[PDB]
Amino acid sequence: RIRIRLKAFDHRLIDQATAEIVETAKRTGAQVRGPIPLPTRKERFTVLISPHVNKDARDQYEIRTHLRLVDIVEPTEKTVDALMRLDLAAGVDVQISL
Amino acid sequence: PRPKTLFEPGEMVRVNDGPFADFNGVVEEVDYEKSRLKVSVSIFGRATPVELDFSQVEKA
Amino acid sequence: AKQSMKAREVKRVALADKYFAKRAELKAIISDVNASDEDRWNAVLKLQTLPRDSSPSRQRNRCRQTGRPHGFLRKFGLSRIKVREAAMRGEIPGLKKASW
Amino acid sequence: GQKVHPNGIRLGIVKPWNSTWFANTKEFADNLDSDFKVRQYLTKELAKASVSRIVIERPAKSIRVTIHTARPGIVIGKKGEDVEKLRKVVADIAGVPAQINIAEVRKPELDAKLVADSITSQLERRVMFRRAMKRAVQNAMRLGAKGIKVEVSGRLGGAEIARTEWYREGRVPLHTLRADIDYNTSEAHTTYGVIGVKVWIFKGEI
RNA sequence: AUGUUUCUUCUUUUUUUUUUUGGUGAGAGG
RNA sequence: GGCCGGGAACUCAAAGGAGACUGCCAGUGAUAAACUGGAGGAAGGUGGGGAUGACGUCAAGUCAUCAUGGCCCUUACGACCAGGGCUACACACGUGCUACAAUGGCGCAUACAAAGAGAAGCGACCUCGCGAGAGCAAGCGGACCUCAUAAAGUGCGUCGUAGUCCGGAUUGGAGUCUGCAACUCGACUCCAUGAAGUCGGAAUCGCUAGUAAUCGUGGAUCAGAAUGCCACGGUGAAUACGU
RNA sequence: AGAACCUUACCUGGUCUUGACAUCCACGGAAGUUUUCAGAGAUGAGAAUGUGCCUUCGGGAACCGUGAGACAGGUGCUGCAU
């Protein structure tokens, strides 16, 4: 029920960053409704690489913003106690959805 | 009595229940029909948007 | 661009946050299905009492790094030549070559 | 009109970024420009300190600044004395609390930026580049680098035309994505215009 | 078939770190 | 009504691996490399596409992104404001769009996408409105909500080779929203109008497959303003004797 | 990657110059906010009201005006000085 929505850039980091909150929630609640995939936005950009004419030369840039869900099922009064102020992975913006 | 909980969008609130107790935040969204306030707590920097009841949090 | 041009923008920033979006009720409610007599004439004309350069439509769009007029990108908030040198320097968190 | 940036295209497999955080679309420009002034003022504050790269990690409502230098003492000042002066003003620039942190590199003859600004200090004090850029090459060949190419361009030597010269020693596989390459740029302002320097340093695998 | 003139040089010397288990009450020995 | 219990194989989703390496067979080839078929296989000779662009060439382009040696102005070539111009018009060229119709146009009924965008932002629903839109206002700071009810396709009716139910430029009138502001100089809409043009001379361009062609959608830019540019998916060819 | 104004670097014309914008120094004035307006607007003439912090209260920081200047500024020329 209690959703936890993850947001990051480094997809090779978020699977361990969600694993860092899996282990923080496993030893407390013992029931977590999985690391759901949650599709990622691919914000596409294109830029004139020249500082002038020849609008044929361009470079394409994108940012895959990856999402996850943790979704703590039961609100036993020790699970969230081990979550608030006890997280990590600087650069991975986290959020609850409840 | 101490029952202050009314918070509109952008209004700061106070949490005194659950692990989010002793923390303040703002209510980005409100739900009078569901009797729930959408406020996030600055936990480890990142805002932690969580739903708290009017009695679960106090108006700031 | 010009140091003269970048100064006009922040001056027109100071008009867009003091007068407009705050004294914007001059057209929001009073220039509608309300009293459509010549009191509604006082709605459109008092909007002219505020300066012309105060509207958010007047604040064009300029880069923040160098202030180039054209080739702007809203996401990065800065000019197209400046988003690329910072892409190759490794400044925007996540821009790699889109080679899909 | 060729040769796209080495530090540009490796940023998903070899080398990390220099600003690692996530901010949404409303505050993406606000986060980015604040990074630009903490890179401008700090390099301005620590020009002589031989700083190569700066890492900016914001976990939201905070900023972890990392400074990679070959001169640790000058960066930290006297046991952190200059850092607290920065702490008052780095937090004043980005408008957010700043946890200043310091890293280091042991071999400045293998870090691209440290090789490049060295020739910048050389060529702005009126020295011959031919044995100044040769100096940097023979430095890295015996310091553990598998290969290094150094390029200088401009109207060097006081000449009328822009004589350009490049020189390498060892492997520099620019195309190979498996090949790590340390590359950075620096420019020198003499009275003979601007002389830009570019240097590539190859190390190895994933 | 045709496409003006004149019209572009090299040094070889240059380079410091490094951090300044207390109180109270009683008894006893000299 | 996947709407509700419920299910975890499936589509899908997001991570990590398996997999295609001339690895196996046969002929050919100097017991070479390798080539031409066959087998198994989702895929086979770099599977398809993309990024990636060697020293140098034009002493190519940019001093107008920015940086910068000179050179020069500094009651100025610097600066501030209102209005105009960049859109002006005998004429030629470049690049596109709409068409010249019958595998076509108009009306009715109905099928099938992908990808992307969204907070002083996208906007259901209901309601006034022929229409552009307006009022009240769900939800959604987002696989859930919305933009957003795809187009040819098909089934049928129907016009009948005509400058005409083709084409719709231009022109008059009445209005819609954005914005201080639509006159010079926005887009759009309703009613009216109805041009040239009836497949294009010398010459020239693109393309070898999910390509050409054709159809519709989305996006960045953006107060507003695409037929352009950048992306997406639907439909789906011909020919390659050969140097 | 989109000129109605802005953009805009151009023209007609109205104005201003240690200045549209920055560092430094001198003295006054907090800053701010509301209103009448000269005029096309700029700028200028004003009229109310407010006069916050540090107290080294004989002054700093935040900030506006006035004065002297050292300067600032240039989408001005040279891409064959770079």
Curated annotation (Swiss-Prot), chain A:
GO molecular function, a single term: transcription antitermination factor activity, RNA binding
UniProt gene name: rpsJ
Keyword line: Ribonucleoprotein, Ribosomal protein, Ribosome biogenesis, RNA-binding, Transcription, Transcription antitermination, Transcription regulation
Protein name in the entry: Small ribosomal subunit protein uS10
GO cellular component terms given for this protein: cytoplasm; cytosol; cytosolic small ribosomal subunit; small ribosomal subunit; transcription elongation factor complex
Protein family (similarity comment): Belongs to the universal ribosomal protein uS10 family.
Quaternary structure, from the entry: Part of the 30S ribosomal subunit. Can also form a heterodimer with the transcription antitermination protein NusB. Binding of S10 to NusB is mutually exclusive with its incorporation into the ribosome. The rRNA transcription and antitermination complex (rrnTAC) consists of RNAP, NusA, NusB, NusE (this protein), NusG, SubB, ribosomal protein S4, DNA and precursor rRNA; S4 is more flexible than other subunits.
InterPro entries linked to this entry: Ribosomal_uS10 (IPR001848), Ribosomal_uS10_CS (IPR018268), Ribosomal_uS10_dom (IPR027486), Ribosomal_uS10_dom_sf (IPR036838)
SMART domains membership: Ribosomal_S10
Pfam families per UniProt: Ribosomal_S10
GO terms of biological process kind: cytoplasmic translation; regulation of DNA-templated transcription elongation; ribosome biogenesis; transcription antitermination
Curated annotation (Swiss-Prot), chain B:
Subunit comment: Monomer. Interacts with the transcription termination factor Rho and with RNAP. One NusG monomer forms a stable complex with a Rho hexamer. Binds directly, but weakly, to the core enzyme of RNAP. Also interacts with RpsJ (NusE). The rRNA transcription and antitermination complex (rrnTAC) consists of RNAP, NusA, NusB, NusE (rpsJ), NusG, SubB, ribosomal protein S4, DNA and precursor rRNA; S4 is more flexible than other subunits.
Main function: Part of the processive rRNA transcription and antitermination complex (rrnTAC). The complex forms an RNA-chaperone ring around the RNA exit tunnel of RNA polymerase (RNAP). It supports rapid transcription and antitermination of rRNA operons, cotranscriptional rRNA folding, and annealing of distal rRNA regions to allow correct ribosome biogenesis. Participates in transcription elongation, termination and antitermination. In the absence of Rho, increases the rate of transcription elongation by the RNAP, probably by partially suppressing pausing.
Domains: entry comment: The N-terminal domain interacts with RNAP and the C-terminal domain binds either to Rho or to RpsJ (NusE). These domains are separated by a flexible linker.
Highest taxon of source: Bacteria
Family under the similarity heading: Belongs to the NusG family.
Domain KOW as annotated: residue spans: 9-40
A single cellular component GO annotation: cytosol
Protein name: Transcription termination/antitermination protein NusG
Curated annotation (Swiss-Prot), chain C:
Similarity comment: Belongs to the universal ribosomal protein uS14 family.
Keywords: Ribonucleoprotein, Ribosomal protein
Name assigned to this protein: Small ribosomal subunit protein uS14
A biological-process GO annotation: ribosomal small subunit assembly
Quaternary structure and partners: Part of the 30S ribosomal subunit. Contacts proteins S3 and S10.
Pfam family, one: Ribosomal_S14
UniProt GO molecular function: rRNA binding; structural constituent of ribosome; tRNA binding
Functional note: Binds 16S rRNA, required for the assembly of 30S particles and may also be responsible for determining the conformation of the 16S rRNA at the A site.
Record HAMAP family: Ribosomal_uS14_1
Gene3D superfamilies: 1.10.287.1480
This protein's GO CC annotations: cytoplasm; cytosolic small ribosomal subunit; small ribosomal subunit
Source organism: Escherichia coli (strain K12)
Extent of the signal sequence: none
Curated annotation (Swiss-Prot), chain D:
Residue ranges the record marks as coiled coil: none
Alphabetized InterPro entries for the sequence: KH_dom, KH_dom-like_a/b, KH_dom_type_2, KH_sf_prok-type, Ribosomal_S3_C_sf, Ribosomal_uS3_bac-typ, Ribosomal_uS3_C, Ribosomal_uS3_CS
Keyword Ion transport: no
Keyword Nucleotide-binding recorded: no
A GO biological process held by the record: cytoplasmic translation
UniProt keyword annotations, A-Z: Ribonucleoprotein, Ribosomal protein, RNA-binding, rRNA-binding
Gene Ontology cellular-component annotations: cytoplasm; cytosol; cytosolic small ribosomal subunit
GO MF annotation, one: structural constituent of ribosome
KH type-2 domain ranges (all copies): 38-106
Subunit structure: Part of the 30S ribosomal subunit. Forms a tight complex with proteins uS10 and uS14. With proteins uS4 and uS5 encircles the mRNA as it enters the ribosome, which may play a role in mRNA helicase processivity. Some nascent polypeptide chains are able to cross-link to this protein in situ. In collided ribosomes contacts ribosome rescue factor SmrB.
Family named by the database record: Belongs to the universal ribosomal protein uS3 family.
Role, per record: Binds the lower part of the 30S subunit head. Binds mRNA in the 70S ribosome, positioning it for translation. Plays a role in mRNA unwinding by the ribosome, possibly by forming part of a processivity clamp.
Protein name: Small ribosomal subunit protein uS3
Species assigned in the record: Escherichia coli (strain K12)
Lineage, opening ranks: Bacteria, Pseudomonadati, Pseudomonadota, Gammaproteobacteria, Enterobacterales
